[PDB]
A paper describes a structure:
The two gel-forming mucins MUC5AC and MUC5B constitute the main structural components of the mucus protecting the underlying epithelia in the respiratory system. The VWD assemblies are formed by the VWD domain, C8, trypsin inhibitor like (TIL) and E domains, except the VWD’ domain that only has the TIL and E domains. We determined the cryoEM structures of the wild type D3 assembly of the human MUC5AC mucin and the structural single nucleotide polymorphisms (SNP) variants Arg996Gln and Arg1201Trp that affect intermolecular interactions.
We produced recombinant proteins with each variant separate as well as with both arginines replaced. The double mutant Arg996Gln Arg1201Trp showed a ratio of 96:4 confirming the effect of the mutations. Even though no major rearrangements were found, both SNPs can affect the equilibrium between the dimer open and closed conformation. A high prevalence of double mutants is not observed except in Finnish population, where both mutants are present independently in 10.9% and 23.9%.
Residue numbers in the entry:
A (entry chain B), B (entry chain A): 901 to 1229
The structure:
């Protein structure tokens, strides 16, 4: 159970519902109290804005704003921005970047994952079941009642469900998308050649467990649509979505190849030093000044991305100068 | 003095002449005896074929064939293929891959550099001056007489000069190219943003020496034209052309950034081992079973690409399993 918003309008609910829509507006994914009685009076809210990326019109998210007790977080250009420093209580969120994921976790039990480019995953702890409303549907493990359109009513119109959670009072109404591959037929051969890796023998373990046909067509559509420049990032995000979906099951897999989506972990390594090896499965509990060896958050998973390989001498990471120091003074 | 064929129809002669043309045919760059008296009776010849890469019609080279004493080399799909094993004399060429360059050298003194995708550079030793004919012009350090169109005549028509060196008797005549950026105006902003790095402070050392305006517009044109997919490779080749042109002067520079054209030298490193650090300047003389420490070819330059960093124990490279073994048994 985890919200899966990625690429161009691909969504997967907690209860396991897959739909699609595109719209250039502001939307909220997770709300507290559903606008009613404030039971826990926390009023958590996560919102996002879509920009017309790509000439096909298939917009993708650009910025994410998080509201928590009068505290606001702005995510844009790969840098975290905070607006509003309430002089009460304290900081309730932790900002941590792991691999190619930007992770923010709340003391309430809310965990968000950010690829810093397009994708985003939201998971909810079981104590908040049912009483959550948004585009991700009610967290009740029932794919039937996940279409509550701000009025406790389930409607078969995915477009109506998506439009019901717009934020700007004066914002253009979203509409059904076109066919990216029919729009760009000349890219179809290259797109199929690139996205065929998912059905290749490398991902056979996940193929034997889940059905990647939806993710396969998602990769094809994303590659077809991405035509204004930098299609490599579109393809990499499309693949990494299914990679994470397989990883969260529990069985680690490896899919990176120097010809496709190549990381450059050597760059962070300074001169005369080599302590950054890519970890496919995902690093276990680490040690650093902020998070000691004995302390770790197990709600996170292996994920992916370059991680430092600190020497046995000074294995603690610093997180301020991106190196392994013995201890932060 | 070095032939510089790269991207989509970009050529620079030994004597320093820059022109451009595109054509889907077979052409010869360097010929021996110019079809006349065989002085050294070596009859060296390098030929190439152009394929309609990209929807703009700007073709780029795909395969290179080398003729040397009845020995033929086929270069396609990133793998070297040899056709014709004469049962006389011996092998006169050495096939070696260094960094992101595939290098073949002849005992005569001919050196070729291959990026395995599009680009190619040809240098000539001084003993072969003047008596060489081809698209690269006569090797006499004179930009005036480099337009010999197979008849010892210089013609101001670059198109005519290019067509005069076609090989297939029945092959379509080449024509002047269009404007890639006018063809794809929506890509102009992204292309300028990507190609502006050359004029950025990183390459100021070469900016203070050579004039990169031609290379700047070449990068812009290449990024504009590359639209059928994989524009990242087009941009990377366009940048690396100027990078090599600056490197051959003598002053080493660094331009790689994990956000742009990122190498994945970590991949070659096996588990528990980190002995592949990217070298910007280019590795000095190496040691291996084929080429010992005392033996090295100094005609080559630093170039670029991932190189192994063998430990002080077993520093010899094997070249058969891509690792550093003590000595080949
Ligand atoms: Ca539901
Ligand atoms: Ca000349």
């Amino acid at each position: 159970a985890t919200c899966a918003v990625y690429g161009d309008g691909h969504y997967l609910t907690f209860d396991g519902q897959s739909y699609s829509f595109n719209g250039d507006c502001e939307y909220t994914l997770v709300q507290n109290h559903c606008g009613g009685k404030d039971s826990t009076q926390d009023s958590f809210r996560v919102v996002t804005e879509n920009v017309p990326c790509g000439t096909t019109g298939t917009t993708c998210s650009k910025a994410i704003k998080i509201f928590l007790g009068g505290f606001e977080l702005k995510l844009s250009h790969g840098k975290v921005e905070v607006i509003g420093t309430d002089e009460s209580q304290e900081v309730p969120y932790t900002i941590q970047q792991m691999g190619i994921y930007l992770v923010v976790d709340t003391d309430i039990g809310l965990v968000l994952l950010w690829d810093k480019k397009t994708s985003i995953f939201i998971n909810l702890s079981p104590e908040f079941k049912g009483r959550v409303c948004g585009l991700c549907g009610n967290f009740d493990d029932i794919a039937v009642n996940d279409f509550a359109t701000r009025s406790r009513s389930v409607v078969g119109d995915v477009l109506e469900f998506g439009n019901s959670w717009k934020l700007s009072p004066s914002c253009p109404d979203a509409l059904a998308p076109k066919d990216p591959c029919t729009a760009n037929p000349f890219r179809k051969s290259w797109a199929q050649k690139q996205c065929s890796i998912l059905h290749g023998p490398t991902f056979a373990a996940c193929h034997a467990h889940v059905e990647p046909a939806r993710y396969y067509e998602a990769c094809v559509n994303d590659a077809c649509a991405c035509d204004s420049g930098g299609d490599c990032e579109c393809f990499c995000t499309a693949v990494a979505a299914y990679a994470q979906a397989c990883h969260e099951v529990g069985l680690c897999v490896s899919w990176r190849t120097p010809s496709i989506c190549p990381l450059f972990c050597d760059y962070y390594n300074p001169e005369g030093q080599c302590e950054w090896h890519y970890q496919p499965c995902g690093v276990p509990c680490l040690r650093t000044c902020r998070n000691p060896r004995g302390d770790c958050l197990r709600d996170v998973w292996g994920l992916e991305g370059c991680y430092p390989k600190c020497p046995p001498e000074a294995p603690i990471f610093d997180e301020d100068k991106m190196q392994c120091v013995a201890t932060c003074p």
